[PDB]
């Protein structure tokens, strides 16, 4: 199972994440990539536009730079620490 995981992983292929820089339309959304250059990418009708919001992390195919789906927003330890403190 563990050696099968590698063969599966090579077929899944590394993903590019951006983040919603700025809604422009339902059909076209402006993202700024984590790697770098600003892009206008598209959104599939498989993923509702209400989920997509400013500062939510999103995942896009390389091939065509289009958002497949939402990801949970980046885990920031800092704001977790702030909440915790008091006890």
């Amino acid at each position: 199972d563990k050696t099968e995981n590698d063969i599966k992983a090579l077929q899944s292929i590394g993903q590019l994440i951006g983040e919603v820089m700025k809604e422009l339309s339902e059909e076209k959304y402006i993202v700024k990539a984590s790697s770098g250059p600003r892009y206008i990418v598209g959104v599939r009708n498989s993923v509702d536009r209400s989920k997509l919001k400013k500062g939510v992390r999103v995942t896009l195919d390389i091939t065509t730079l289009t958002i497949m789906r939402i990801l949970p927003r980046e885990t920031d330890p800092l704001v977790y620490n702030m909440t915790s403190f008091e006890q």
Partner: protein, 298 residues
């Protein structure tokens, strides 16, 4: 097993494949072909990605006699999981021309392999269908409630085509035809209006003839079809509704805006008259000059 099989999308590559397989086994004219269909499943949309011919022998003396080479389907699967893991066993295609009660038995053998419900994709390779020559059917197990035992049956699931982006750009580039219906210009949809009527007329006939066959050929009473037909007569539009009177005002709006837009095109054509006409008047002058200029050199 899995009950998520709400939609079926079909790559055109599959379609292309099904005729190819039929001809390479040299099966023809009421010789049948069974192959595996591979793709994604345990998901609402069953995505049929590919198909591949299997060893199959067809016997006409006993229709419940066939060969399938069971080991081979396992083996081939092993290879393709290595190529791409997303492909899995998802059932089996038949070439038709029609569904049979032997295809029920056949289903059962694929059921063992499959961790989904085996999808039976009836690809008519001959394509005699006016529309879709492809039906999709899923084996379900349900009590047929009439005083009859548990019945296993193939219930129709509408299917649609779909193309991967990567294939699709190439599909479009191959094609260049003007189409029977593209939803183009006025004249094109107009053809579709003549077609759509003749569509309905054949379609309704099929219903009338089933109703005969129930009391003349003793086809089992299916209270379900007849139930749906009650809903047709019950929800039927009628005239003398205030809805007619509403449509009747609407008619008048649709022609009146048309009328005014007709009148506006009159003004545009009349404009071009003037402009081309002004040019002609000038053309008379340049022509006369030619003759005038010839005199001066002489």
């Amino acid at each position: 097993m899995s009950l998520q099989h709400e939609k079926v999308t079909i790559a055109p590559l599959v379609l292309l494949s099904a005729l190819d397989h039929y001809e390479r086994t040299q099966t023809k004219e009421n010789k049948r072909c069974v192959g595996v269909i591979l793709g994604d499943a345990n998901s609402s949309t069953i995505r049929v990605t590919n198909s591949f011919a299997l060893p199959f022998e067809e016997d006409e003396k006993n229709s419940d006699v066939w060969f399938l080479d069971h080991n081979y389907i396992e083996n081939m699967n092993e290879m393709c999981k290595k190529i791409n893991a997303k492909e899995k066993l998802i059932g089996w295609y038949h070439s038709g021309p029609k569904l049979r009660a032997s295809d029920l038995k056949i289903n059962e053998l694929f059921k063992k392999y499959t961790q989904n419900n085996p999808l039976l994709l009836i690809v008519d390779v001959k394509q005699q269908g006016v529309g879709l020559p492809t039906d999709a059917y899923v084996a379900i197990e349900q009590v047929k409630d009439d005083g009859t035992s548990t019945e296993k049956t193939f219930l129709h699931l509408p299917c649609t085509i779909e193309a991967e982006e990567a294939e699709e750009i190439g599909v479009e580039h191959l094609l260049r035809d003007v189409r029977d219906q593209a939803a183009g210009g006025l004249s094109i949809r107009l053809t579709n209006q003549l077609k759509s009527l003749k569509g309905l007329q054949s379609k309704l006939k099929d219903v009338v003839e089933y109703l005969d066959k129930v009391i003349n050929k003793e086809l089992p009473i299916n209270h379900t079809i007849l139930g749906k037909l009650q809903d047709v007569f019950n929800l039927l539009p009628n005239l003398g509704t205030p809805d007619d009177d509403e449509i009747d005002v609407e008619n008048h709006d649709r022609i009146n805006i048309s009328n005014n837009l007709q009148k506006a095109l009159t003004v545009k054509t009349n404009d071009e008259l003037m402009v081309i006409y002004i040019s002609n008047l000038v053309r008379s002058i340049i022509a006369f000059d030619d003759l005038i200029e010839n005199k001066i050199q002489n």
